Design an enzyme around this catalytic site. Structure first.
Site, PDB file in Angstrom:
ATOM      1  N   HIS A   1       0.803  -1.220   0.000  1.00 25.59           N
ATOM      2  CA  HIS A   1       0.000   0.000   0.000  1.00 25.59           C
ATOM      3  C   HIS A   1       0.839   1.275   0.000  1.00 25.59           C
ATOM      4  CE1 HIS A   1       0.911   1.030   4.108  1.00 25.59           C
ATOM      5  NE2 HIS A   1       0.340  -0.048   4.613  1.00 25.59           N
TER       6      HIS A   1
ATOM      7  N   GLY B   1       4.035   6.125  10.600  1.00 26.60           N
ATOM      8  CA  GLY B   1       5.260   5.676   9.970  1.00 26.60           C
ATOM      9  C   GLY B   1       5.740   4.308  10.397  1.00 26.60           C
TER      10      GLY B   1
ATOM     11  N   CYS C   1       4.254   1.294   9.584  1.00 26.36           N
ATOM     12  CA  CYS C   1       4.006   0.231   8.612  1.00 26.36           C
ATOM     13  C   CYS C   1       5.312  -0.283   8.022  1.00 26.36           C
ATOM     14  CB  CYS C   1       3.069   0.705   7.499  1.00 26.36           C
ATOM     15  SG  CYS C   1       1.322   0.593   7.934  1.00 26.36           S
TER      16      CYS C   1
END
Lengths: 306, 306
Positions: free
Chosen positions: A41, A143, A145
């Site tokens: 993503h 931040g 991920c």
């Protein structure tokens, strides 16, 4: 002596964390040899997330559209592919600090260590358990991920989790290292709610064994029960059913304490029916279910073989 | 989202852990530059620990009496000295993985990460708090002596604890990296008992603020109290006194929640007198005091500067 929630040393995983930037989005990637793994993503804009076509966005992207930075050095992407929900960026340079690793898919009830990272830099390490509803209750900020969950099996670092999402209830969802989500969650902005959770019964029993090993004995009783009639109370208090395989897993702890698993089940039954009597167990006033039987063995070695 | 007990990444400290052997005793050492730090009681036999004169035992020891191993490589000892209760072994080779480090002495109520090691090999990392009675509630097995506690403040590793001994109550005691014990404990077999412990009040309040941030609001009330009237109850339940310095430290959390510090004190007052009535706060049935206000801010940053 003592019993604490303990994570594995994160050094070997720290040497693999990188920063991956696509457009305005920056997250963390896992740099193993000449391949960088990160959540797919990252190739989506904010508007794409509403209804993303990842096959289309992947074709539209070029190698130079992906900026991978291992600390201060920029890594040149020479190929980009997609395995399910994970993006795979082949880079120019093989990671000299790549450890012996495996990709494993854990089951609900098992634990692993989470290395929370930001901008490709580790920030903290803590232990998490895969809940029966296939979520984890971690601590993640913006931040995070691409942060990975892992276990160390003596010399091999087994990666089992990559962080993808936060659900509306505050819990977290992610995939294995092959891109397959844990649970029925998808990497797009749609109505996904974590199912109702249950308590990991075999983990509670192992945690009660750890208490006995460390000197806490007030909750023990002379009673014994059967697997069937204990599972009746277990279902009545939203506990996972206890199986013969779960009893076998608890064998070592039962061996070193001399307490049969079904005797500990009788103690657990009375604790569920009458409460904790205002006392604590290993520094908790609740029954803790995020310690696996192996997690207990790691901190509670027996005296059988010294 | 989420709030978890989180330790610092241990990689930089893992690269400094070595194995130190004297006679039959093996423990862990800290390899910084050309000096290895370890507990001085490694030079004592089992009988020596009953009444050791460390100055004499050091004279009997030679450089070759100390076998230092950095993983698989043997380190040549070229000098042995004593700084208070820590042994300092100067070696031929400077550790190439020495990070930017400082030696600091922390206060009761402050937290740090413990890298539990055995035979010079890291095993786990977890968060610990310095109790008011100058002990820590860790998890240590045989061979854990020499394990260190640390904080990382951006590339700088601040070492604050070295593990030396376990007390009869199961708690743990040690020194700073200069050899000075925390509390009135000595590295000898004597009648030493950790004093009666108290709860870190400022840490409970910070933990209550973290609960409000994460959606737990049932314990809040419209009641108000003064610092004097709160501290009366605090002493009445073995809580540390709350000072004006503690109230200021909690300033950011009180601004971010819109809850005055003394209103949270009123909530803590009611929680101390009547309990939680079968409800939970951040997944705990106890008031937690091992989270410092900075630890909470670290996991609950404000929106002031985004």
């Amino acid at each position: 002596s003592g019993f604490r929630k303990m994570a594995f040393p994160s050094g070997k995983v720290e040497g693999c964390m990188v920063q991956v930037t696509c457009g305005t989005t920056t997250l963390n990637g896992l740099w193993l040899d000449d391949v960088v793994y990160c959540p797919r993503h990252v190739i989506c804009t904010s508007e794409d997330k509403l209804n993303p076509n990842y096959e289309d966005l992947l074709i539209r992207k070029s190698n130079h559209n992906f900026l991978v930075q291992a600390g201060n050095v920029q890594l040149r992407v020479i190929g980009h592919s997609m395995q399910n929900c994970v993006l795979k960026l082949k880079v120019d340079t093989a990671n000299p600090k790549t450890p012996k690793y495996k990709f494993v898919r854990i089951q609900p009830g098992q634990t692993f260590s989470v290395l929370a990272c930001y901008n490709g830099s580790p920030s903290g390490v803590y232990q998490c358990a895969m809940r029966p509803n296939f979520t984890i209750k971690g601590s993640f900020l913006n931040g995070s991920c691409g942060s990975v969950g892992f276990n160390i099996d003596y010399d091999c670092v087994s990666f089992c989790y990559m962080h993808h999402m936060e659900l509306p209830t505050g819990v977290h969802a992610g995939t294995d290292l092959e891109g397959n989500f844990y649970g029925p969650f998808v990497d797009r902005q749609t109505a996904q709610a974590a199912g109702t959770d249950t308590t990991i019964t075999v983990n509670v029993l192992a945690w009660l064994y750890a208490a006995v090993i460390n000197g806490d004995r007030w909750f023990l009783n002379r009673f014994t029960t059967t697997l069937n009639d204990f599972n009746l109370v277990a279902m009545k208090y939203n506990y996972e059913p206890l199986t013969q395989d779960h009893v076998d897993i608890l064998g070592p702890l039962s061996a070193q304490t001399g307490i049969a698993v079904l005797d500990m089940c009788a103690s657990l039954k009375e604790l569920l029916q009458n409460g904790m009597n205002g006392r604590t167990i290993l520094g908790s006033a609740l029954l803790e279910d995020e310690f696996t039987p192996f997690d207990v063995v790691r901190q509670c070695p027996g005296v059988t073989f010294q």
